[PDB]
Subunit: 90 residues, 2 copies
Amino acid sequence: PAFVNKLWSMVNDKSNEKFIHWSTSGESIVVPNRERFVQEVLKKYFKHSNFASFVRQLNMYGWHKVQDVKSGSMLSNNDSRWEFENERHA
Amino acid sequence: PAFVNKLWSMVNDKSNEKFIHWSTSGESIVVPNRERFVQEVLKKYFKHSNFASFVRQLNMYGWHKVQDVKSGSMLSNNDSRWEFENER
């Protein structure tokens, strides 16, 4: 698939480090800030695509959003931070 | 507002993938088959409603049908395939 070569050309090019990168721990792909990623990287590789479109593709290739961790007494989660894990590597 | 929540609860739920989904290429909402969408998904999320009614609501919230692409020597268009784009 063309998607695949594009995903990797994106994630494994360290120049995109501040917007999407392999997590430090675990085996996952982290997007620290959804909006900034969409603005700065997504369109560079997937012209005229949006976040939901991107995520639907990731899903077709086995990548799924990691279960929310609820923090502190507010049980908060930064909705703009997304982490994706592959079903073949739990 | 009630419409909007139903709209997204429908489009962004993976289980509805065969009947309605974000476009692979582009930033649009695709209904590959109108009739199957109406029978299987629409009449589940929007009881007592219909396609036309749904489209008019989409239109009021900024979503419009994407221009028809005429294909091949027959200048054909699949009338049951609908794709909607937001005016932005």
